[PDB]
Amino acid sequence: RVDVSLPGASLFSGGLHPITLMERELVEIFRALGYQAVEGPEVESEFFNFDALNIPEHHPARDMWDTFWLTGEGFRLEGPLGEEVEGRLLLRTHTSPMQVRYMVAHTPPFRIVVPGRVFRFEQTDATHEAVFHQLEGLVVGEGIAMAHLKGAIYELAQALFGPDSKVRFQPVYFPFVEPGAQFAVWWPEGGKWLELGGAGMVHPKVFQAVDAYRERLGLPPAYRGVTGFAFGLGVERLAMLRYGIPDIRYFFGGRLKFLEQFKGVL
Amino acid sequence: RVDVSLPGASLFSGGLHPITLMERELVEIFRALGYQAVEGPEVESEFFNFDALNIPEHHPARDMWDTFWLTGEGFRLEGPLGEEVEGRLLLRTHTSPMQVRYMVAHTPPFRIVVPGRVFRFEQTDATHEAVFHQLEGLVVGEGIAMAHLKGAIYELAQALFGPDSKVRFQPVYFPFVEPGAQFAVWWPEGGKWLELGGAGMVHPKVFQAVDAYRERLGLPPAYRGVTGFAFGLGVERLAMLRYGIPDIRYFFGGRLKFLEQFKGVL
Amino acid sequence: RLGCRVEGEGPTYRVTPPSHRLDLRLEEDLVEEVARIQGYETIPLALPAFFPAPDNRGVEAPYRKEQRLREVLSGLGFQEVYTYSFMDPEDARRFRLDPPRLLLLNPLAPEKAALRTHLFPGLVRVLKENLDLDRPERALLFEVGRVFREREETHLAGLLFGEGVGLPWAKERLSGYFLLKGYLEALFARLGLAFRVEAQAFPFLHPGVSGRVL
Amino acid sequence: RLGCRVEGEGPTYRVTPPSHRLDLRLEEDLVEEVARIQGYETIPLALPAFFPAPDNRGVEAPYRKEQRLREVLSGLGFQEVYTYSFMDPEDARRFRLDPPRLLLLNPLAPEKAALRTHLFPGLVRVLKENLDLDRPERALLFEVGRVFREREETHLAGLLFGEGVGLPWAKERLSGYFLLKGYLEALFARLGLAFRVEAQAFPFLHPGVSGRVLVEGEEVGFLGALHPEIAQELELPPVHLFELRLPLPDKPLAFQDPSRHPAAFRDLAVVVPAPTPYGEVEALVREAAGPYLESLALFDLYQGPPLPEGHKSLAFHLRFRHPKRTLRDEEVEEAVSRVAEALRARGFGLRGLDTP
Ligand SMILES: [Mg+2]
Ligand SMILES: [Mg+2]
C-alpha cells in the first residue's frame, strides 16, 4: 500500500524580503494613480545630491544629512545624458537627486516614483540604520497645486489603512520645497497618528538648476512655467509597523529564520 | 574531473497561456488609469445579460448575439447581493452584464474593468470561436463625458502601440449606449487601422434599470444625476496580432508545442 | 437640416423628430445627431479626475489574489492550460462522476452538450491528445477555471505525467505521487498555508494512491 | 499682521518683509506664510488629470523587468537576501578578488570601509552566520543588488548549500553543481533565453567545478563550486554559487507554427575521448543534424569496458520533423549520415546509430 501522508520530494520554495514586499506594495499604489517607477544610482555626486536640490556648502541644512563621503580612482559616474559628471563623490543620503536627474532628461508633464536604498552615517540601533530605503515621488506640470499633493497622500492613506483613514499636514522646512510640510496618517486600528514623511511644492531654485543644467548640455529649457510637488517616505518604518517587525536591524541581518516568515506575503 | 557543460537536474519550468499574458497586459494598462478589475459569472440570467442592458425580446438587436441557452435543475444563480435571481439561464454572450451587477451593488463614482470568457453559438474557424474572451470597462460619475471616453482609448493605443499611435472613432449602434461608436487604432508598424471595439455613453435606460432594481432590493437609488461611458474589446484579436498567432483555434487546442512558445513572455 | 421641427427660444427646446426616424425618441438620441453631423473627430480628448466613492475601494483584492496564484504556479514549474467549459455527458461515466447539472438546449455538438463539473477530465484529454501528436516524455500542467454544479465555482487542478526529475544521463529519478505531492507542499509554503493529505477513496482515483487535501 | 509693509493696490503687490525674517525672500516664501497662518488644514483635496509628455511613456519598463526577475526567482524556489553595500577590504584577499575601487573616508568600521565589488562574498558570510546560529540542513538563496567597480552595475547572485532535493525518508538525493545548474536552466527557460556553461577558471572558484555562464551567446558571469581552500579558511562545507550581471538580454517572440506532421525518432551514441566536453559534442551533432532537427537529448553517459579506455560514450535521442510534410526515411537516413560523417572527421566514433 502507498502511504499518501508520507512527505513528498523536498523541492525548495522561495520567498521575498520584507522590504521588497513593502516596496512593491507602495509602487502599485502609486501606479494606480498614474506614477511610473524609475531607479537611480546609489553612488552620487555632491551636485545632484546637494547643490541642485538647494542644499549648499556650510549651511544648517547640510547638517540634516550625515553623509558618507567616498574616495576612489578610476570610477566613472555618469550623468542623466550619459555625460561624465564631475563632483565630489558620496553615497546618496536620499533619493531626491534622482528627481533632478529625471527632470533634466525628460519633459513635463509627468508623475514619477523612485524607490531606493539610501545611506546616512549613524549608529545602528533597534530603530536606526545607516543603510535603509526611501521612496520619493514627483509630479510636474502646468497647474499642479498643493491641493493635488494633499490628494495624493490622501489616496496613499486610504490604500494602506482603509476608508476610515485620514491625513494631516503641518509646516516644516526643507531646502528644496516651499511651501513645505510633514504629513501624518490616522491609523484607525492603532488609534494614533503616524508621522510618515515630508512633502511640499518644488522650490523655484530647483527648477532653475534643472534648466540651467539642461542648457549646459544643449537641451532647451522645460521648467519655466510649471509648478510641481514632491513627497518622500521611509519604507522600513512602514514595513515594521505593517508586518510587526520590532527591530530594524533584522532587515539586513540575513537570518533565514526571520526572512522565511514572509514567504506567505504574496 | 567534473564536466560543467553536462545538463543539470531536469526541474520543470512553467509558462502562462497567451490569453493570460494578454489579459494581464490590458489590466495593468487600465490599472495605471485608476481602473479596478472585477470578474463576473459565466452562467447568467437573461435579465442581466439582455433585459437590463436595453436588449429586449424579439428585437433586431437580439440577433447580434448568438446565445447558448441552458437547462438544468437544482442550479443556484445568485444576484449582486447574494439574492436568488430568477430568469431564463444562458451562457453570457458578453461581459456587459457584470457592469449592471456592479452598479446595483456599488455607488458612484468609480472606474472598473471586467475581463471574462464569453460564449456565442458559432462555427469555429481560423478566426471564429464559440468560446473566447472580452474585456469591458465602465466609468460612472458626475460630469463624465465622451471626451473622457476618447481620452481613455487614446491612452490604451499609446500603451499598446506607442506614441506614434492614434485612435479613430465612428458612429455605430448598441442598444445600451447613446452616443455609440466603434474605435480603431493606428498601428504604425502594421501601417493600417485596426478595428478594436465599441464604446459609447451609457444609455439612460440602463441606469433606470439599475436603480429600479436597487429599489426592489431596498437600496436607495444612486444613478440619478450621473453620466458614464463604457467600452469593450476582444482579447484574442489583440493576442493574435500582438504575438503573431495565425489560428484562433490554437488558444483552446491545448497543444504543449504551442503553449511552450509563450514561456518567455513574462 | 435633419428635418426636425424645433420650437422654443431656449435654453430648453422642444424638438419633434421626423416620422421616418424611428430611432429619435430621447434627448441623448438627439445629442448623438449633433455629434455625427459635426463629426466624432470634433470631440476633444480628456481624462477624468475623481476620488472613488468608498465602497469601490479594495474591490480588486480577489482578482489580484487569483492572478498571483497563477503566477506562483508557473513559477514553481507548472504549465498553464485552457480548456473548453463544455463537457461530453458520456464522460461523466468514463470518469465516474455524478452527471452534469447544466446542459445546453442548443449545443455545438453532442460531446459539448454539458457544462463541466470537474476540471481534471479535460486536462486528462489534452494530455492524451498531446501524446498522440507529439510524444512528450513528461508534462506538469495546471488550469484555473469555472466549474458548474449546484453553484458556479472556481477550481484549480493539475496533473503530472512522465519520467520525472533527475540527471538526464542517469536513471535515478524523482517521480509520481511523491513528486507531485512535493510540488504541492512547495506551492503551499509559498502561499503560507497549512497543507495535509489524509487518505480517502474517490471513484476516479486509484484506491492505493488516493487522498484528500486539507 | 506679520509685520510686512505692503505697497500697491494690486493685482501684484510689493511686499517688503521685516528685517528679522531672514527666510522671506521669494514670492513662494510669502505664499507659505498665507498658508501657515490660514492653516494647512484649509487647503482642499484634489487629484490632477493630464496626458504625460511623450518621452515619459514606457519609462518604467526597466524597473518592471527586474521586478519580474525577482518574482520568477522566488517562484522557482530561491530565498531572497539583503546584504549591506559595504565590504571588508581584507575580504578582497580572503576570496581572491581585485581590491575595492571605492572606499569610504568616514566608514562606520574598518570592515565596512569599502564598497562591494561582488555580491557572493556577502551571501557566503550570511550563510556561515546562519549555520552558527541555527544549523540549516540546506539553503538556496539569491540577491539582486548594486555592485561598484569602474561603473556602478546591478548583479544577480545565488548560492546552494546542504543536503538537496529527494524523498525525506530516503538517501538518494539530487544536489550540488548539477542541481544548481538545474535551477538555472529552469530559470532561463522561463525568461526564454539561451543559457550555456563553458568551463573556465576563476580564482575564487574550484578548478574542477568552475565555468562561465553564456546567456544568449554572451559571457555574463560564472557558476561553480567554492574553492576548497577558501572554504577551509572560513570553516564552511562545500557551497555552489553563481553571479551574473543584470539586465539580461531581451529576446522577442518569434512565433513558430508547430508542424501538424509526425516527428521521426532516432538514437545514436558518440564515442569521445574522456576530456572532450559534452557541450562540444552536442554542438557538433546539432550543427550537422540539419534544419529538420527538432530535439536532441543526452540519455546516457558511459565510460569503461569495452569502450576503448580513456573514452566515454554519449547517448542521444534525436527527433527530426519536417514542417509542411512527413519525412522520407532517406531524408532522415541521409541526414543522420551528415552527422556520422562530421562526427568522425572531428575524430569521434559511433558507438551506435539508427536505433528505433
Ligand atoms: Mg441613435
Ligand atoms: Mg519658508
User: For the residues of D75-102, what is the DSSP string, one character each?
Assistant: HHTPEE----SEE-TTHHHHTT-PPPS-
| Cα–Cα nearest to A106, from D50, D64, D58, D152 | D58
* B122 annotated to bind ligand: no
CB atoms within 10 A of CB A46: 17
Give whole-number Cα distances, D174 to A13, C170, C173, D216, in Å: 16, 11, 9, 27
| Cα–Cα nearest to D233, from D95, D348, D35, D77 | D95
Rounded-to-integer distance, Cα B175 and Cα B168, Å: 21
CB atoms within 10 A of CB C118: 18
C194 Cβ neighbours under 8 A, 6+ residues apart: C188, C214
Does the beta carbon of C79 lie under 8 angstroms from any beta carbon of chain B?
A: yes
Enumerate the active-site residues of B. 65, 94, 120, 134, 177, 230
Rounded-to-integer distance, Cα B242 and Cα C198, Å: 46
Radius of gyration of chain D (CA): 31
Rounded-to-integer distance, Cα D149 and Cα D117, Å: 6
* Helices (H), ranges, A32-182: 46, 97-105, 146-161
Q: Which residues of D155-164 are buried (b: 16+ CB within 10 A; e: fewer)?
A: bbbbbbbbeb
Please indicate, yes or no, whether residues C126 and C28 belong to a single structural domain of this protein. Answer: no
Please indicate, yes or no, whether residues D85 and D34 belong to a single structural domain of this protein. Answer: no
Rounded-to-integer distance, Cα B169 and Cα B148, Å: 13
Judged on CB neighbours under 10 Å (0-12, 13-18, 19+), A209 is: buried
Give residue for cell 545514436.
D268
B37 Cβ neighbours under 8 A, 6+ residues apart: B27, B30, B31, B112, B113, B114, B115, C60, C63, C64
Give whole-number Cα distances, D334 to C194, D118, D340, in Å: 58, 51, 10
Contacts of D76 in chain A (CB under 8 A): 12, 14
> Are B122 and B79 a contacting pair, CB within 8 Å?
no
| Cα–Cα nearest to A23, from A161, A133, A181, A131 | A133
Q: Domain containing D6: what range?
A: 1-45
φ, ψ dihedrals at A171, nearest 5°: -70, 145
Beta bridge partners of D211: D199, D223
User: For the residues of chain B, what is the DSSP string, one character each?
Assistant: ---TTS--------B--HHHHHHHHHHHHHHTTT-EE----SEEEHIIIIITTT--SS-GGGGGS--EEEE-TT---B-TTSPBP-S-EEE-SSSTHHHHHHHHHS-SSEEEEEEEEEE-----BTTB-SEEEEEEEEEEETT--HHHHHHHHHHHHHHHH-TT--EEEE----TTEEEEEEEEEEETTTTEEEEEEEEEEEPHHHHHHHHHHHHHTTPPP--SS-EEEEEEEEHHHHHHHHHT---GGGTTT--HHHHGGGSS--
> Are D225 and D177 a contacting pair, CB within 8 Å?
yes
Q: What is the CATH number of the domain that holds C7?
A: 3.30.56.10
C203 Cβ neighbours under 8 A, 6+ residues apart: C96, C97
> Are A156 and A165 a contacting pair, CB within 8 Å?
no
Amino acid identity at B25: E
Distance A61 CA to ligand 2 centre (A): 13
* Helices (H), ranges, D102-142: 120-133
Rounded-to-integer distance, Cα D235 and Cα D255, Å: 51
Rounded-to-integer distance, Cα B241 and Cα B191, Å: 13
Are β-strands A36-37 and A110-119 bridged in parallel, bridged antiparallel, or unpaired?
A: parallel
- Written as nine digits, the cell of D208 is 574542477
φ, ψ dihedrals at D170, nearest 5°: -145, 165
Please indicate, yes or no, whether residues C102 and C132 belong to a single structural domain of this protein. Answer: yes
Displacement of CA D31 from its chain's centroid (Å): 52
Nearest CA in chain C to B68: C106
Beta bridge partners of C143: C157
Contacts of B28 in chain A (CB under 8 A): 31
- Please give the interface size between C and D, counted as residue pairs whose CB atoms are below 8 Å apart: 56
Rounded-to-integer distance, Cα D106 and Cα B7, Å: 48
Please indicate, yes or no, whether residues D268 and D244 belong to a single structural domain of this protein. Answer: no
- Written as nine digits, the cell of C150 is 449546484
Beta bridge partners of C148: C152
Beta bridge partners of D241: D159, D224
CB atoms within 10 A of CB B149: 28
Radius of gyration of chain C (CA): 28
Rounded-to-integer distance, Cα A265 and Cα A84, Å: 42
> Are D255 and B261 a contacting pair, CB within 8 Å?
yes
Rounded-to-integer distance, Cα D182 and Cα D199, Å: 16
Tally DSSP H helices, then E strands, for chain A. Answer: 7, 10
Beta bridge partners of C147: C153
Give whole-number Cα distances, D228 to A242, B6, D224, D235, D341, in Å: 43, 22, 12, 10, 43
B182 Cβ neighbours under 8 A, 6+ residues apart: B169, B170, B171, B172, B195, B197, B198, B199
Displacement of CA D9 from its chain's centroid (Å): 68
- Written as nine digits, the cell of B220 is 436607495
Radius of gyration of chain A (CA): 21
Q: In what order do the strands lie in the sheet with A43-45?
A: A43-45, A89-91, A68-71, D103-104, D114-115, D86-87
**From start to end of A7-99, where are the E strands?**
36-37, 43-45, 68-71, 89-91
Rounded-to-integer distance, Cα C7 and Cα C17, Å: 11
Rounded-to-integer distance, Cα A114 and Cα A102, Å: 10
| Cα–Cα nearest to A186, from A165, A207, A215 | A165
CATH of A1-266, one of 3.30.830.10, 3.30.2130.10, 3.40.50.200, 3.30.930.10: 3.30.930.10
| Cα–Cα nearest to C207, from C98, C114, C58, C96 | C96
Length of chain B in terms of residues written: 266
Whether omega before A109 lies within 30 degrees of 0, making that bond cis, reads yes
**D55 within some domain:** no
φ, ψ dihedrals at A184, nearest 5°: -130, 150
State which of D205, D225, D250 marks the end of a domain: D250
| Cα–Cα nearest to B148, from B109, B174, B176 | B109
- Written as nine digits, the cell of C214 is 486539507
Q: Which H or E run includes A115? A: strand A110-119
Contacts of A5 in chain C (CB under 8 A): 196-199, 211
Rounded-to-integer distance, Cα B10 and Cα D182, Å: 6
Please indicate, yes or no, whether residues C132 and C32 belong to a single structural domain of this protein. Answer: no
Amino acid identity at B194: L
**C51 within some domain:** no
Q: What is the CATH number of the domain that holds D278?
A: 3.30.70.380
Verify whether the Cβ–Cβ distance D43 to A147 is below 8 Å. Answer: yes
Verify whether the Cβ–Cβ distance A31 to B31 is below 8 Å. Answer: yes
How many alpha carbons fall within 13 Å on the CB side of residue C159?
Answer: 17
Contacts of B9 in chain D (CB under 8 A): 165, 174, 178-179, 181-182
> Are D284 and D232 a contacting pair, CB within 8 Å?
no
Please indicate, yes or no, whether residues D188 and D306 belong to a single structural domain of this protein. Answer: no
- Per 3-state DSSP, chain A is made up of helix, strand and coil in percentages (nearest 5) of 30, 25, 40
Rounded-to-integer distance, Cα B151 and Cα B34, Å: 13
Under DSSP, is residue D127 helix (H, G, I), strand (E, B) or coil?
helix
C134 Cβ neighbours under 8 A, 6+ residues apart: B255, B256, B257, D263
Under DSSP, is residue A43 helix (H, G, I), strand (E, B) or coil?
strand
- Written as nine digits, the cell of A215 is 542648457
**D23 within some domain:** yes
Please indicate, yes or no, whether residues D245 and D168 belong to a single structural domain of this protein. Answer: yes
**C171 within some domain:** yes
Beta bridge partners of B71: C103
Rounded-to-integer distance, Cα B114 and Cα A62, Å: 51
How many alpha carbons fall within 13 Å on the CB side of residue D129?
Answer: 14
> Are D142 and D80 a contacting pair, CB within 8 Å?
yes
Does the beta carbon of A181 lie under 8 angstroms from any beta carbon of chain D?
A: yes
**From start to end of D175-263, where are the E strands?**
195-199, 205-215, 218-226, 240-245
A9, A41, A141 member nearest D165 (Cβ) = A9
> Are D100 and D61 a contacting pair, CB within 8 Å?
no
> Are B113 and B120 a contacting pair, CB within 8 Å?
no
Q: What angle do CA D260, D261, D263 make, to 5 degrees?
A: 125
**D50 within some domain:** no
Domains contained in chain D, number: 3
Judged on CB neighbours under 10 Å (0-12, 13-18, 19+), D347 is: exposed
Beta bridge partners of B202: B177
User: What is Dmax (Cα atoms) for chain A?
Assistant: 81
Verify whether the Cβ–Cβ distance A36 to D59 is below 8 Å. Answer: yes
Beta bridge partners of D138: D162
Tally DSSP H helices, then E strands, for chain D. Answer: 8, 18
| Cα–Cα nearest to D323, from D256, D267, D265, D266 | D256
Beta bridge partners of D165: D174
φ, ψ dihedrals at B265, nearest 5°: -75, 70
Chain C closest-CA separation from residue D55 CA (Å) = 19
Please indicate, yes or no, whether residues C132 and C190 belong to a single structural domain of this protein. Answer: yes
Which three-class secondary structure string do you get for chain C? CCCCEEECCCCCCEEECCCCCCCCCCHHHHHHHHHHHHCHHHCCCCCCCCCCCHHHCCCCHHHHHHHHHHHHHHHHCCEECCCCCEECCCHHHHCCCCCCCCEECCCCCHHHCEECCCCHHHHHHHHHHHHHHCCCCEEEEEEEEEEEECEEEEEEEEEEEECCEECCCCCCEECCHHHHHHHHHHHHHHCCCCCCEEECCCCCCECCECEEEC
- Written as nine digits, the cell of B107 is 455607488
Give whole-number Cα distances, A54 to A62, A211, A217, D345, in Å: 10, 14, 20, 72
* Helices (H), ranges, chain D: 27-38, 61-76, 91-94, 120-133, 177-190, 228-233, 278-289, 329-345
Chains near A (3 or more Cβ pairs under 8 Å):
B, C, D
Resolution rounded to one decimal, in angstroms: 2.9
> Are C82 and B17 a contacting pair, CB within 8 Å?
yes
Amino acid identity at C123: L
D115 Cβ neighbours under 8 A, 6+ residues apart: A43, A70, A72, A91, D85, D86, D87, D100, D101, D102, D103, D104, D148
| Cα–Cα nearest to C52, from A183, B154, B148, B112 | B112
Does the beta carbon of A3 lie under 8 angstroms from any beta carbon of chain C?
A: yes
Rounded-to-integer distance, Cα C57 and Cα C150, Å: 31
φ, ψ dihedrals at A139, nearest 5°: -125, 130
**C201 within some domain:** yes
Chains near C (3 or more Cβ pairs under 8 Å):
A, B, D
Give residue for cell 520525472.
C164
- Written as nine digits, the cell of D170 is 530516503
Please indicate, yes or no, whether residues D226 and D142 belong to a single structural domain of this protein. Answer: yes
Rounded-to-integer distance, Cα A100 and Cα A49, Å: 9
Q: In what order do the strands lie in the sheet with B131-141?
A: B36-37, B110-119, B131-141, B227-234, B192-202, B177-187, B167-170
A137 Cβ neighbours under 8 A, 6+ residues apart: A30, A35, A111, A112, A113, A114, A152, A230, A231, A232
Rounded-to-integer distance, Cα A75 and Cα A42, Å: 13
| Cα–Cα nearest to D210, from D171, D241, D254 | D241
**C146 within some domain:** yes
Residue boundaries of the structural domains of chain A: 1-266
| Cα–Cα nearest to C77, from C192, C163, C213, C184 | C184
Distance B90 CA to ligand 2 centre (A): 66
